[PDB]
Coordinates of C-alpha atoms and ligand atoms in Angstrom, one line a residue:
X1 CA -67.9 139.3 273.1
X2 CA -71.2 141.0 274.0
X3 CA -73.1 141.9 270.8
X4 CA -76.6 142.5 269.3
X5 CA -78.1 139.1 268.1
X6 CA -77.3 138.7 264.4
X7 CA -80.5 136.7 263.6
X8 CA -82.7 139.4 265.4
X9 CA -80.7 142.2 263.6
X10 CA -81.3 140.6 260.2
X11 CA -85.0 139.6 261.0
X12 CA -85.5 143.2 262.1
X13 CA -83.8 144.7 259.1
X14 CA -85.5 142.7 256.2
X15 CA -88.9 141.9 257.8
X16 CA -90.5 138.4 258.3
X17 CA -91.6 137.9 254.8
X18 CA -88.1 138.4 253.1
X19 CA -86.5 136.7 256.1
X20 CA -88.6 133.6 255.4
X21 CA -87.9 133.7 251.7
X22 CA -84.2 134.3 252.2
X23 CA -83.8 131.5 254.7
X24 CA -85.8 129.1 252.4
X25 CA -83.4 130.0 249.5
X26 CA -80.4 129.5 251.9
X27 CA -81.5 125.9 252.8
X28 CA -82.6 125.0 249.2
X29 CA -79.2 126.1 247.9
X30 CA -77.2 124.2 250.6
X31 CA -79.3 121.0 250.3
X32 CA -80.5 120.8 246.8
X33 CA -81.7 117.2 246.9
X34 CA -83.7 117.2 250.2
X35 CA -87.6 117.4 249.8
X36 CA -89.6 120.5 250.2
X37 CA -91.2 119.2 253.5
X38 CA -87.7 119.1 255.1
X39 CA -86.8 122.6 254.0
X40 CA -90.2 123.9 255.2
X41 CA -89.5 122.4 258.7
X42 CA -86.1 124.0 258.8
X43 CA -87.3 127.4 257.7
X44 CA -90.1 127.4 260.4
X45 CA -87.5 126.5 263.1
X46 CA -85.2 129.3 262.1
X47 CA -88.1 131.8 261.9
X48 CA -89.3 130.7 265.4
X49 CA -85.8 131.2 266.7
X50 CA -85.5 134.6 265.1
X51 CA -88.8 135.7 266.7
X52 CA -87.7 134.3 270.1
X53 CA -84.4 136.4 269.8
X54 CA -86.2 139.6 268.6
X55 CA -88.3 139.3 271.8
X56 CA -85.4 138.6 274.1
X57 CA -81.8 138.9 272.6
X58 CA -80.5 137.0 275.6
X59 CA -82.6 133.9 274.6
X60 CA -80.7 130.6 273.9
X61 CA -78.9 130.5 270.5
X62 CA -79.6 134.2 270.0
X63 CA -75.9 135.0 270.3
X64 CA -74.8 132.4 267.7
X65 CA -73.5 133.2 264.2
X66 CA -76.0 132.7 261.3
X67 CA -73.7 129.8 260.1
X68 CA -73.9 128.2 263.6
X69 CA -77.7 128.5 263.4
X70 CA -78.1 127.1 259.9
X71 CA -75.5 124.4 260.6
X72 CA -77.2 123.2 263.9
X73 CA -80.7 123.2 262.5
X74 CA -79.4 121.1 259.5
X75 CA -77.4 118.7 261.6
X76 CA -80.2 118.2 264.3
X77 CA -82.9 117.1 261.7
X78 CA -83.0 113.3 262.0
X79 CA -85.4 113.4 258.9
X80 CA -82.3 114.1 256.7
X81 CA -82.2 110.3 256.2
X82 CA -78.6 110.2 254.7
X83 CA -80.2 108.3 251.9
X84 CA -78.9 111.7 250.8
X85 CA -75.1 111.5 251.3
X86 CA -72.8 114.1 253.0
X87 CA -75.3 115.4 255.6
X88 CA -73.2 113.6 258.3
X89 CA -70.0 114.3 256.3
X90 CA -70.2 118.1 257.0
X91 CA -71.9 117.8 260.4
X92 CA -68.7 116.0 261.6
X93 CA -67.0 119.5 261.3
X94 CA -66.7 122.5 263.6
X95 CA -67.3 126.0 262.2
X96 CA -65.8 127.4 260.1
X97 CA -65.0 124.1 258.3
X98 CA -68.7 122.9 258.5
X99 CA -70.1 125.9 256.7
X100 CA -67.3 125.6 254.0
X101 CA -68.2 121.9 253.7
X102 CA -71.9 122.6 253.0
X103 CA -70.8 125.3 250.5
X104 CA -68.4 123.1 248.6
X105 CA -71.3 120.6 247.9
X106 CA -73.3 123.2 245.8
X107 CA -74.0 121.3 242.5
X108 CA -74.3 123.5 239.4
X109 CA -76.3 120.8 237.6
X110 CA -78.2 118.7 240.2
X111 CA -79.8 115.4 238.9
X112 CA -83.4 116.6 238.6
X113 CA -86.3 116.6 235.9
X114 CA -86.7 119.8 233.8
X115 CA -89.1 121.9 236.0
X116 CA -92.4 120.7 234.5
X117 CA -94.8 123.5 234.0
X118 CA -98.4 122.6 234.9
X119 CA -101.2 123.5 232.5
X120 CA -102.6 127.0 233.0
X121 CA -105.8 126.0 234.7
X122 CA -103.9 123.8 237.3
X123 CA -101.3 126.5 237.7
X124 CA -103.9 129.2 238.4
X125 CA -105.8 126.8 240.8
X126 CA -102.8 125.9 242.9
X127 CA -102.0 129.7 243.1
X128 CA -105.6 130.5 244.3
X129 CA -105.6 127.5 246.5
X130 CA -102.6 128.6 248.8
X131 CA -100.1 131.4 248.0
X132 CA -97.6 130.5 250.6
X133 CA -97.2 126.9 249.7
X134 CA -97.2 128.0 245.9
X135 CA -94.4 130.5 246.4
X136 CA -92.6 128.3 248.9
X137 CA -92.5 125.6 246.3
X138 CA -91.4 128.1 243.6
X139 CA -88.4 129.6 245.6
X140 CA -87.4 126.1 246.5
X141 CA -87.6 124.7 243.0
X142 CA -85.7 127.7 241.4
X143 CA -83.0 128.0 244.2
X144 CA -82.1 124.3 244.3
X145 CA -81.6 124.2 240.5
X146 CA -79.6 127.5 240.5
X147 CA -77.6 127.4 243.7
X148 CA -75.9 130.7 243.2
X149 CA -79.0 132.6 242.0
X150 CA -78.7 136.2 243.3
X151 CA -81.0 135.9 246.3
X152 CA -82.7 139.3 246.5
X153 CA -83.4 139.1 242.7
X154 CA -85.0 135.7 243.2
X155 CA -87.5 137.3 245.7
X156 CA -88.1 140.0 243.0
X157 CA -88.9 137.2 240.4
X158 CA -91.4 135.6 242.8
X159 CA -93.2 139.0 243.0
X160 CA -93.1 139.3 239.3
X161 CA -94.5 135.8 238.9
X162 CA -97.3 136.6 241.3
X163 CA -98.3 139.6 239.2
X164 CA -98.5 137.6 236.0
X165 CA -100.7 135.0 237.9
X166 CA -103.0 137.7 239.3
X167 CA -103.5 139.2 235.9
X168 CA -103.8 136.0 233.9
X169 CA -105.7 133.7 236.3
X170 CA -109.0 135.6 235.9
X171 CA -108.9 135.8 232.1
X172 CA -111.3 134.1 229.6
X173 CA -108.3 132.2 228.3
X174 CA -105.7 131.8 231.0
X175 CA -103.1 129.9 229.0
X176 CA -102.7 132.4 226.2
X177 CA -102.4 135.4 228.5
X178 CA -100.1 133.4 230.8
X179 CA -97.8 131.5 228.4
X180 CA -95.9 134.2 226.5
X181 CA -95.5 136.0 229.9
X182 CA -94.2 133.2 232.0
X183 CA -91.9 132.4 229.1
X184 CA -90.4 135.9 229.0
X185 CA -90.0 135.9 232.7
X186 CA -88.2 132.5 232.7
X187 CA -85.8 133.8 230.0
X188 CA -84.9 137.0 232.0
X189 CA -84.4 134.9 235.2
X190 CA -82.1 132.4 233.3
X191 CA -80.0 135.3 232.1
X192 CA -79.9 136.7 235.7
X193 CA -78.8 133.3 237.1
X194 CA -76.1 133.1 234.4
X195 CA -74.9 136.7 235.1
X196 CA -74.7 136.0 238.8
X197 CA -72.9 132.7 238.3
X198 CA -70.2 134.7 236.5
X199 CA -69.9 137.2 239.3
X200 CA -69.5 134.3 241.8
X201 CA -67.0 132.5 239.7
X202 CA -64.9 135.7 239.1
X203 CA -64.8 136.3 242.9
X204 CA -64.2 132.6 243.9
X205 CA -61.7 131.6 241.2
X206 CA -59.9 134.9 240.3
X207 CA -60.3 136.9 243.6
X208 CA -62.3 140.0 244.7
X209 CA -60.1 142.2 242.3
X210 CA -61.5 140.4 239.2
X211 CA -65.1 141.3 240.1
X212 CA -64.2 144.8 241.4
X213 CA -62.6 145.6 237.9
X214 CA -65.6 144.2 236.1
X215 CA -68.0 146.2 238.4
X216 CA -65.8 149.4 237.9
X217 CA -66.1 149.1 234.2
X218 CA -69.9 148.5 234.1
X219 CA -70.8 151.2 236.7
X220 CA -68.6 153.8 235.0
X221 CA -70.6 153.2 231.7
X222 CA -74.0 153.4 233.7
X223 CA -73.1 156.4 235.7
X224 CA -70.5 158.3 233.8
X225 CA -71.3 161.7 235.4
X226 CA -70.4 160.3 238.8
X227 CA -67.0 161.0 240.1
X228 CA -64.4 158.2 240.6
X229 CA -64.7 158.3 244.3
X230 CA -68.4 157.6 244.3
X231 CA -68.1 154.9 241.6
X232 CA -65.3 153.3 243.7
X233 CA -67.5 153.4 246.8
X234 CA -70.4 151.7 245.0
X235 CA -68.0 149.0 243.6
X236 CA -66.8 148.4 247.1
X237 CA -70.3 148.0 248.5
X238 CA -71.4 145.8 245.6
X239 CA -68.4 143.6 246.0
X240 CA -69.3 143.0 249.6
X241 CA -72.9 142.3 248.5
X242 CA -71.9 139.7 245.9
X243 CA -69.2 138.0 248.0
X244 CA -71.9 137.5 250.7
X245 CA -74.5 136.2 248.3
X246 CA -72.1 134.0 246.4
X247 CA -71.0 132.5 249.7
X248 CA -74.5 131.8 251.0
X249 CA -74.7 134.6 253.5
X250 CA -78.0 135.6 252.0
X251 CA -79.6 137.6 254.8
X252 CA -76.5 139.8 255.0
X253 CA -76.4 140.1 251.2
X254 CA -80.0 141.2 251.0
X255 CA -79.6 143.7 254.0
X256 CA -76.4 145.2 252.5
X257 CA -78.0 145.4 249.0
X258 CA -81.0 147.3 250.4
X259 CA -78.6 149.7 252.2
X260 CA -76.7 150.2 249.0
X261 CA -80.0 151.0 247.1
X262 CA -81.0 153.4 249.9
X263 CA -77.5 155.1 249.6
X264 CA -77.6 155.5 245.8
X265 CA -81.1 157.0 246.0
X266 CA -80.0 159.5 248.7
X267 CA -77.1 160.5 246.5
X268 CA -78.9 160.4 243.2
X269 CA -78.1 164.0 242.4
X270 CA -74.4 163.3 242.0
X271 CA -74.7 159.8 240.4
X272 CA -77.5 159.9 237.7
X273 CA -80.6 161.8 236.9
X274 CA -81.9 158.4 235.7
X275 CA -82.1 157.2 239.3
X276 CA -85.4 159.1 239.9
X277 CA -87.4 156.3 238.1
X278 CA -86.1 153.7 240.6
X279 CA -85.9 155.7 243.7
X280 CA -89.7 156.2 244.0
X281 CA -90.4 152.4 243.8
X282 CA -90.7 149.8 246.6
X283 CA -87.6 147.9 247.9
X284 CA -87.2 144.9 245.5
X285 CA -88.4 146.8 242.4
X286 CA -86.1 149.7 243.4
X287 CA -83.0 147.6 243.6
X288 CA -83.9 145.6 240.4
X289 CA -84.4 148.9 238.6
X290 CA -81.0 150.2 239.7
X291 CA -79.4 146.8 238.9
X292 CA -80.2 147.2 235.1
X293 CA -80.7 150.9 234.6
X294 CA -80.0 152.3 231.1
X295 CA -76.7 154.3 230.8
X296 CA -76.7 158.0 231.6
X297 CA -75.4 160.2 228.8
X298 CA -71.7 161.0 228.7
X299 CA -71.0 164.5 230.3
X300 CA -70.0 167.1 227.6
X301 CA -66.5 168.5 227.6
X302 CA -64.3 165.8 229.1
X303 CA -60.6 166.0 228.2
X304 CA -59.0 163.7 225.7
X305 CA -58.1 160.5 227.5
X306 CA -54.5 160.7 226.1
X307 CA -53.8 163.8 228.3
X308 CA -54.0 161.9 231.7
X309 CA -52.9 158.4 230.4
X310 CA -50.3 159.1 227.7
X311 CA -49.1 162.7 227.7
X312 CA -48.8 163.2 231.5
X313 CA -45.1 163.2 232.5
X314 CA -46.1 161.2 235.5
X315 CA -47.7 158.2 233.8
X316 CA -44.8 155.9 235.0
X317 CA -44.6 157.5 238.4
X318 CA -48.4 157.0 239.0
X319 CA -48.4 153.4 237.7
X320 CA -45.4 152.6 239.9
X321 CA -46.4 154.4 243.0
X322 CA -50.2 153.8 243.1
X323 CA -50.9 151.1 240.5
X324 CA -54.5 150.1 241.4
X325 CA -55.6 153.7 241.9
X326 CA -54.0 154.7 238.5
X327 CA -55.3 151.7 236.5
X328 CA -58.7 151.9 238.2
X329 CA -58.8 155.5 237.1
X330 CA -57.9 154.4 233.6
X331 CA -60.8 151.9 233.6
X332 CA -63.2 154.6 234.9
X333 CA -62.1 157.3 232.4
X334 CA -61.9 155.0 229.4
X335 CA -65.2 153.1 230.2
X336 CA -67.3 156.2 230.9
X337 CA -66.3 157.4 227.4
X338 CA -67.2 154.2 225.8
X339 CA -70.8 153.0 226.8
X340 CA -70.9 151.2 223.4
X341 CA -68.2 148.7 224.3
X342 CA -68.6 145.3 226.0
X343 CA -67.3 145.1 229.6
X344 CA -64.9 142.3 228.6
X345 CA -63.5 144.4 225.7
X346 CA -62.9 147.3 228.1
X347 CA -61.1 145.0 230.6
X348 CA -58.9 143.6 227.7
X349 CA -58.0 147.2 226.8
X350 CA -57.2 147.9 230.4
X351 CA -54.9 144.8 230.4
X352 CA -53.1 145.8 227.3
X353 CA -52.6 149.4 228.7
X354 CA -51.1 147.9 231.9
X355 CA -48.8 145.5 229.9
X356 CA -47.5 148.4 227.9
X357 CA -46.7 150.4 231.0
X358 CA -45.0 147.3 232.6
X359 CA -42.7 147.0 229.6
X360 CA -42.3 150.8 228.7
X361 CA -41.7 152.2 232.2
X362 CA -38.7 149.8 232.5
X363 CA -37.0 151.4 229.4
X364 CA -34.8 154.6 229.1
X365 CA -37.5 156.6 227.3
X366 CA -41.0 155.4 228.5
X367 CA -43.0 158.0 226.5
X368 CA -41.4 157.1 223.3
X369 CA -42.3 153.5 224.1
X370 CA -46.0 153.9 225.1
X371 CA -46.8 157.0 222.9
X372 CA -48.9 154.8 220.5
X373 CA -50.7 152.8 223.4
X374 CA -54.3 154.2 222.9
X375 CA -54.0 153.7 219.1
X376 CA -52.8 150.1 219.6
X377 CA -56.4 149.3 221.0
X378 CA -58.0 149.5 217.5
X379 CA -56.9 146.0 216.4
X380 CA -58.2 144.5 219.7
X381 CA -61.5 146.4 219.1
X382 CA -61.8 145.5 215.5
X383 CA -60.7 141.8 216.0
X384 CA -64.3 140.2 216.5
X385 CA -66.2 142.3 213.9
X386 CA -65.7 140.1 210.8
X387 CA -66.4 136.8 212.5
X388 CA -69.4 138.5 214.4
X389 CA -70.9 139.7 211.1
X390 CA -70.4 136.3 209.5
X391 CA -72.0 134.5 212.5
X392 CA -75.0 136.9 212.6
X393 CA -75.3 136.4 208.8
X394 CA -75.2 132.6 209.5
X395 CA -78.0 133.0 212.1
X396 CA -80.0 135.4 209.8
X397 CA -79.8 132.8 207.2
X398 CA -80.1 129.5 209.1
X399 CA -82.8 130.4 211.8
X400 CA -82.6 129.2 215.5
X401 CA -82.7 125.5 215.2
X402 CA -80.2 125.2 212.4
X403 CA -77.9 127.9 213.9
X404 CA -77.8 125.9 217.1
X405 CA -77.0 122.8 215.0
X406 CA -74.2 124.6 213.3
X407 CA -72.7 125.6 216.7
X408 CA -73.3 122.2 218.2
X409 CA -71.2 120.7 215.4
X410 CA -68.6 123.4 215.7
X411 CA -68.1 123.1 219.5
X412 CA -68.3 119.3 219.6
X413 CA -65.4 119.2 217.0
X414 CA -63.5 121.8 219.2
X415 CA -63.8 120.0 222.6
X416 CA -65.3 116.5 221.9
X417 CA -64.4 115.0 225.3
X418 CA -66.9 117.4 226.9
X419 CA -70.1 115.5 228.0
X420 CA -73.0 115.4 225.5
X421 CA -75.6 117.1 227.8
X422 CA -73.1 119.9 228.5
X423 CA -72.3 120.5 224.7
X424 CA -76.1 120.5 224.0
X425 CA -76.9 123.0 226.7
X426 CA -73.9 125.2 225.8
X427 CA -74.6 125.3 222.0
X428 CA -78.3 126.0 222.6
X429 CA -77.4 128.9 224.7
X430 CA -74.9 130.2 222.2
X431 CA -77.7 130.0 219.7
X432 CA -79.8 132.3 222.0
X433 CA -77.1 134.9 221.7
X434 CA -77.9 134.9 218.0
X435 CA -81.5 135.5 218.6
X436 CA -81.0 138.1 221.3
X437 CA -78.2 140.1 219.6
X438 CA -78.1 139.7 215.8
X439 CA -81.3 141.7 215.3
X440 CA -79.7 144.8 216.8
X441 CA -78.0 147.3 214.5
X442 CA -74.2 146.5 214.3
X443 CA -73.2 149.3 216.8
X444 CA -75.3 147.5 219.4
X445 CA -74.7 144.0 218.2
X446 CA -70.9 143.6 218.9
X447 CA -71.2 144.6 222.6
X448 CA -74.3 142.4 223.1
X449 CA -72.6 139.3 221.8
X450 CA -69.3 139.8 223.7
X451 CA -70.8 140.0 227.1
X452 CA -73.4 137.3 226.6
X453 CA -70.7 134.9 225.4
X454 CA -68.8 135.6 228.6
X455 CA -71.8 134.4 230.7
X456 CA -72.4 131.2 228.5
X457 CA -68.7 130.3 228.3
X458 CA -68.6 130.6 232.2
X459 CA -71.4 128.1 232.3
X460 CA -69.3 125.8 230.3
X461 CA -66.3 126.4 232.6
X462 CA -68.3 125.7 235.8
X463 CA -70.0 122.5 234.3
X464 CA -66.6 121.2 233.2
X465 CA -65.1 121.9 236.5
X466 CA -67.8 119.4 237.9
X467 CA -66.9 116.6 235.3
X468 CA -63.4 117.6 233.9
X469 CA -62.2 115.9 230.8
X470 CA -60.8 118.3 228.2
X471 CA -57.3 119.9 228.6
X472 CA -58.3 122.7 226.3
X473 CA -61.4 123.7 228.3
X474 CA -59.3 123.6 231.5
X475 CA -56.8 125.8 229.8
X476 CA -59.2 128.4 228.4
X477 CA -61.2 128.4 231.6
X478 CA -58.3 128.9 233.9
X479 CA -55.9 131.1 231.9
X480 CA -58.1 134.2 232.2
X481 CA -61.4 135.5 232.7
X482 CA -61.3 138.2 230.1
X483 CA -59.7 136.2 227.2
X484 CA -62.0 133.2 227.4
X485 CA -64.0 134.0 224.3
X486 CA -60.9 134.6 222.0
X487 CA -59.4 131.5 223.6
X488 CA -62.4 129.2 222.7
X489 CA -62.9 131.0 219.3
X490 CA -59.3 130.3 218.3
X491 CA -59.7 126.5 218.8
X492 CA -59.9 124.5 215.6
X493 CA -61.1 120.9 215.4
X494 CA -59.2 118.8 217.9
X495 CA -57.5 116.6 215.3
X496 CA -56.2 114.4 218.4
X497 CA -59.5 113.0 219.9
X498 CA -60.2 109.3 219.2
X499 CA -63.7 108.8 217.5
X500 CA -66.3 106.9 219.5
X501 CA -66.9 103.5 217.9
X502 CA -70.6 103.5 218.0
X503 CA -73.2 101.1 217.7
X504 CA -75.3 104.0 219.1
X505 CA -77.9 101.1 219.0
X506 CA -80.5 100.9 221.8
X507 CA -79.8 104.5 222.6
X508 CA -83.6 104.8 222.3
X509 CA -85.5 105.0 225.6
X510 CA -88.6 102.8 225.0
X511 CA -90.4 105.7 223.1
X512 CA -90.5 107.7 226.4
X513 CA -90.2 110.9 224.4
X514 CA -93.9 111.2 223.5
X515 CA -95.2 112.9 226.7
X516 CA -92.4 115.4 226.0
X517 CA -93.2 118.7 224.1
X518 CA -91.5 119.5 220.7
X519 CA -88.9 121.5 222.8
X520 CA -87.5 118.3 224.5
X521 CA -87.8 116.4 221.3
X522 CA -85.4 119.0 219.7
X523 CA -83.0 118.5 222.6
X524 CA -83.1 114.8 221.8
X525 CA -82.3 115.3 218.1
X526 CA -79.5 117.7 219.1
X527 CA -78.2 115.0 221.5
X528 CA -78.1 112.5 218.7
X529 CA -76.3 115.1 216.5
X530 CA -73.6 115.6 219.1
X531 CA -73.2 111.8 219.3
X532 CA -73.0 111.6 215.5
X533 CA -70.1 114.1 215.4
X534 CA -68.2 112.3 218.2
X535 CA -68.5 109.0 216.2
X536 CA -67.7 110.6 212.8
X537 CA -65.9 113.9 213.3
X538 CA -64.9 114.2 209.6
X539 CA -68.5 113.6 208.3
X540 CA -69.8 116.3 205.9
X541 CA -72.6 118.8 207.2
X542 CA -74.9 117.2 204.6
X543 CA -74.2 113.6 205.8
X544 CA -75.1 114.9 209.4
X545 CA -78.4 116.4 208.3
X546 CA -79.2 113.1 206.7
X547 CA -78.2 110.6 209.4
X548 CA -80.2 112.9 211.8
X549 CA -83.1 112.7 209.3
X550 CA -83.2 108.9 209.7
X551 CA -83.3 109.7 213.5
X552 CA -86.5 112.0 213.2
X553 CA -88.0 109.2 211.0
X554 CA -87.4 106.3 213.5
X555 CA -88.8 108.6 216.2
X556 CA -92.3 109.2 214.8
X557 CA -92.6 105.5 213.7
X558 CA -92.7 103.6 217.0
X559 CA -94.1 106.8 218.7
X560 CA -97.4 106.9 216.5
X561 CA -101.1 107.0 217.6
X562 CA -100.9 103.2 218.5
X563 CA -99.5 101.1 221.4
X564 CA -96.9 98.3 220.7
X565 CA -94.0 96.8 222.8
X566 CA -90.3 97.2 221.7
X567 CA -90.4 98.4 218.0
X568 CA -87.0 100.0 218.6
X569 CA -84.6 97.0 219.2
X570 CA -85.1 95.5 215.7
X571 CA -84.6 99.1 214.4
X572 CA -81.5 100.0 216.5
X573 CA -79.1 97.6 214.7
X574 CA -80.8 98.9 211.4
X575 CA -80.5 102.6 212.0
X576 CA -76.9 101.5 212.8
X577 CA -76.8 100.2 209.1
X578 CA -78.5 103.3 207.6
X579 CA -75.9 105.5 209.4
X580 CA -73.2 103.1 208.1
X581 CA -74.9 103.9 204.7
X582 CA -74.6 107.7 204.8
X583 CA -71.5 108.1 207.2
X584 CA -69.5 104.9 206.4
Ligands
POG1 O1 -57.8 141.4 237.4 C1 -58.8 142.1 236.6 C2 -58.2 142.5 235.3 C3 -59.1 142.2 234.1 O2 -57.9 143.9 235.3 C4 -56.5 144.2 235.4 C5 -56.3 145.7 235.7 C6 -56.3 146.5 234.4 O3 -57.4 146.2 236.5 C7 -57.2 146.0 237.9 C8 -57.6 147.2 238.7 C9 -57.7 148.4 237.9 O4 -58.8 147.0 239.5 C10 -59.0 148.0 240.4 C11 -59.9 147.6 241.6 C12 -59.5 146.3 242.2 O5 -59.9 148.7 242.6 C13 -60.9 149.8 242.6 C14 -60.1 151.1 242.9 C15 -59.0 151.3 241.8 O6 -59.5 151.1 244.2 C16 -59.4 152.5 244.7
DIF2 O1 -67.8 132.9 217.1 C1 -66.8 133.6 216.8 O2 -65.6 133.3 216.9 C2 -67.0 135.1 216.5 C3 -67.6 135.8 217.7 C4 -66.9 136.8 218.3 C5 -67.4 137.5 219.4 C6 -68.6 137.1 219.9 C7 -69.4 136.1 219.3 C8 -69.0 135.4 218.2 N1 -69.8 134.4 217.6 C9 -71.1 134.2 217.8 C10 -72.2 135.1 217.5 CL1 -71.6 136.6 216.7 C11 -73.5 134.9 217.8 C12 -73.8 133.7 218.4 C13 -72.9 132.7 218.7 C14 -71.5 132.9 218.4 CL2 -70.3 131.7 218.8
DIF3 O1 -72.5 124.0 209.7 C1 -72.5 125.0 209.0 O2 -71.5 125.8 208.8 C2 -73.8 125.4 208.3 C3 -74.3 124.4 207.4 C4 -74.2 124.5 206.0 C5 -74.6 123.5 205.1 C6 -75.2 122.3 205.6 C7 -75.4 122.2 207.0 C8 -75.0 123.1 207.9 N1 -75.1 123.0 209.3 C9 -75.8 122.0 209.9 C10 -75.2 120.8 210.6 CL1 -73.4 120.8 210.6 C11 -75.9 119.8 211.1 C12 -77.3 119.9 211.1 C13 -78.0 120.9 210.4 C14 -77.3 122.0 209.8 CL2 -78.0 123.4 209.0
NA4 NA1 -72.7 130.5 254.1

């Protein structure tokens, strides 16, 4: 059917610069293993096409879908050697199968080196040398390692990075200005990637409704003075935005997100007085500001929630005749009254309210049956608090490195079939929850911890879905979204797993470790700890500290200030004996 060219429409809407960045992230996320040169080629072809179509919408290919265009550019690049498999695989398909094929190949942990950070002088020099190649490489490296990174926010990070560089690269000492600041930016962007990967998994694995309910809760806490209608409209629009982003339709995602920020800012009077801060800012800063805005204050003088949800004669009628409208109003009313609760807790409270209606509205006297419903939330609210206190005390007491080691041991004993790199990455990230949340006062501490654990446990679920080995992980991952944390927390040691019979011997890498920073060295020690627990799951915590001690020792030894060939292979069978000494 006759239409306005989609590529020209999106090119026109977002401008060349964001179009180029969004297209580079598109390619880098679909073909994570192809070199930068290849992607650069592709992005230039797409950008020449878009400019051709903007000039004359009738030009060849201008009427095609964005999927057709990305697909044909990909398939027609002979360069794509197929030394990288599956390029032909998906190119065999017609649309829409082709695009689905490219999409099903996104790898949540592609086989790549940690993103090595050059020294500050080099970094500053490359930036000065050529900004476009510098930021091209940056978007490519971050997108291909995080193939569901929320695309407009990745653009925003690139701008933030550029500001840090501009400020630090003139300084007397570049490194010391730069390093804390790149570090803080990296942590915020990792949290962003983890938050977005949970939105995408909620949509993909549990359906649009799972994310709509999550967004309803969060937005009702952020904008509690807004009416239900406006909140619902925002949720609707944000749902479309994240579905498009999570499915690789990034130009549409970015366009639609900008339109949503424009909308919210034009209606800021009836949403939040806090929006004024954001609404004066330029495009990416404006949306980023809105994305994480602090909660507005609760409106004074709202009725008791039991009026509408317990005492109304029509509770059953509304639940039966308009369930999503009634339960969504419940989530809105209850959430706007409780900014201090975690989203996941509010969703679990919504689920328990629903289950009580399902049961009670089927009886002879439903009010009698659900009268105590809102009271019956207290035990769900209170449930975490003792184990949270004890885990924050553990953290307070142990410090980061030992808290991570405690959790590594705990989670390896729970789900010991999980791959060692996954258990290490997961436990380290659980340890960051300690660090980020325990230092808040308790009223802030319980909501911080609950929602961060949901983002880390989702990382576990998605990594396990790639290499699936543990029935228990499958079960907790697939049974729910909102009970994942109680589900994992409830697991004791798996007394059923068969210990690994290990001569862990020659699991030493020719002293490779020494170009590695203290950080990676810690990861290595933590990897050995996981391996110790899988070999001896009934070992004492003290035995583990010790057999790890003998690891640290043998590390420094062959890795000293002198050069010798193969010190490790005489010492592998003999650490094997020293670990047979402490562990049996
Ligand atoms: O599954 C998610 C689960 C955790 O929550 C279960 C239930 C309690 O909440 C589902 C429902 C309330 O979501 C409404 C949304 C889909 O529509 C917005 C609005 C009402 O439509 C107008
Ligand atoms: O670990 C538990 O079972 C208690 C609990 C409940 C809710 C949220 C978090 C936690 N624990 C917890 C805390 Cl409080 C901080 C860092 C890492 C972990 Cl696993
Ligand atoms: O694991 C715990 O519950 C804390 C605890 C208490 C006493 C001794 C060791 C540990 N944890 C622990 C472990 Cl299990 C391995 C390496 C390093 C440390 Cl601090
Ligand atoms: Na797509």
